[PDB]
Each structure stands twice: as C-alpha cells, then as structure tokens.
Design a protein around this nucleic acid. Structure first.
Lengths: 74, 83
RNA sequence: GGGGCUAGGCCGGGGGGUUCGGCGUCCCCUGUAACCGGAAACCGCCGAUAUGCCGGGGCCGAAGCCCGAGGGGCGGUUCCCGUAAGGGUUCCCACCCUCGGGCGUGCCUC
C-alpha cells in the first residue's frame, strides 16, 4: 500500500513501528541517475511505502529518520 | 561487512553517494537493534548503507544521537539532490 | 538437565542480460546481528546429480537443512479494455508466517 499524503504515511509508519518496534524496519533508497527516491517502512506483515521525485520531501524525510532514531534509542 | 563508528559511518556514507550519481542505487536501512551478536539491552538503533556491492553499518546509541541526528539529517540534505 | 567433542549448518536470496543449459564477474529488485581476501566475457567452476571456483576467518553445533501447499508482502511480468491516463488480469518473486512431508536428531562424561 503506497501513500501520497506524506503526513499520513508518517502517521501510519510510526503506528506500525510503535505496534512492534523490534519487528519494524525502515528502508530508504535514492537514485540520482533517475532523480527520485523511495521510503519504505515495514514489519514483515504490513508494508507502507512512499515514492517521490520532489525536493521538498527530503526535509520531511530527514526529520522523520531524525524522529525515529530517538524512539528506537530512548 | 564494515561495522563502523557513528562518526566514520557518515564520511563513508557520504563517499558512497558520490560513487552512485552517474549510476547505481543507494540504500539506507535503519532499525531498532538489541545488541544481538549471535542467534540483552534495547537502547540502540542500527543503520546499514549499501550500493548493492559495498556494505557499511553503524550502531547509534543515546549518548551520540543528538550529534549524529544533526550531521546525518544535514548529510542527507546535501546529497539527496536532483529533484 | 550440566560439561567436553565431532558430523554438520549459517555468514544472504531473487529477476534480467548472456548460455545448449546451471552458477559467477555486468545491470537491476531486495534481506540479515552476520565474512574478509584473489581470479574470471579472448572467460572461471560446472552438466538436469549443473544453482559457481580458490585462499582465509567468525558464529552456531546436533544444530539443522532440503522439497511441496496455502496465506501475508515487494519488485517484475503475461494477457485484455481504453486514444491516453488509468483499470482488470496471468505467471514468477526478496522479505515474513501457517500447515504438510523428506534426511538428521550422533560420540564421550557427571
């Protein structure tokens, strides 16, 4: 299930994490030669995915990665 | 595989992005890590990066998060361009 | 049950290209807590028992490993409708679970 509304994608992602953090993983994939990136979050049953080629997302995403470490760590 | 210091993972990851501009994908897996080294603390996160060929990784824990978060968040921003 | 062993297992898997065909170096999609080093498209190891070769290391250890069915799921792909965007669909499938089989479940000691 791909998302478009980033702000919802996060809202799911973090719930999927909170539900089972030692199961849930978070992948990021970037491809300069195609000028686009993808972000995946998943325990191995449910899967949440967000593809984009928009400069504006990099911030949301870096401040999402930034947001998730916190919770895994503390 | 290359398990690296939080600090050195970044100068590696940053050097990785630069190999894969004219081609290749660059992955960054990031997940909660329980220190496991074979088949019991839980206060650590783990980052893997790879271009399909060379793999690097690092473990980040509470003491070095605020430092890492910043320089990583800031790293990504400088290297995820072309959009 | 505890201790000491050995047999063995894991240290990735898949799609494309190429091949008579099976692996690899190439490209691509993807896992792990988890391999280092060397050579390889004038080719490297192979022959349906083919699913790589050589050198070195770590871990696990009778632990496992392999074959089949279904479900979750990713990336492809077949065919059909459409002018297109889209929509339906066939067959594979990283990653995960369930069930069912096959080989193994050894040696010593307290």
């Amino acid at each position: 299930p791909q998302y478009q509304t980033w702000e919802e994608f996060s809202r799911a992602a973090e719930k999927l994490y909170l539900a089972d953090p030692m199961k849930a993983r978070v992948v990021l994939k970037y491809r300069h030669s195609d000028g686009n990136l993808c972000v995946k979050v998943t325990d191995d049953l449910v899967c949440l995915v967000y593809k984009t080629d928009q400069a504006q997302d990099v911030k949301k995403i870096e401040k999402f990665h930034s947001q998730l470490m916190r919770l895994m760590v503390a | 595989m290359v398990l690296l210091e939080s600090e050195q993972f970044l100068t590696e990851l940053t050097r990785l992005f630069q190999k894969c501009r004219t081609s290749g994908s660059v992955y960054i897996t990031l997940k909660k890590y329980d220190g496991r080294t074979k088949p019991p603390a839980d206060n650590k996160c783990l980052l893997r990066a790879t271009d399909g060929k060379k793999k690097i990784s690092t473990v980040v824990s509470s003491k070095e998060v605020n430092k890492f978060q910043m320089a990583y968040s800031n790293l990504l921003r400088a290297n995820m361009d072309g959009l």
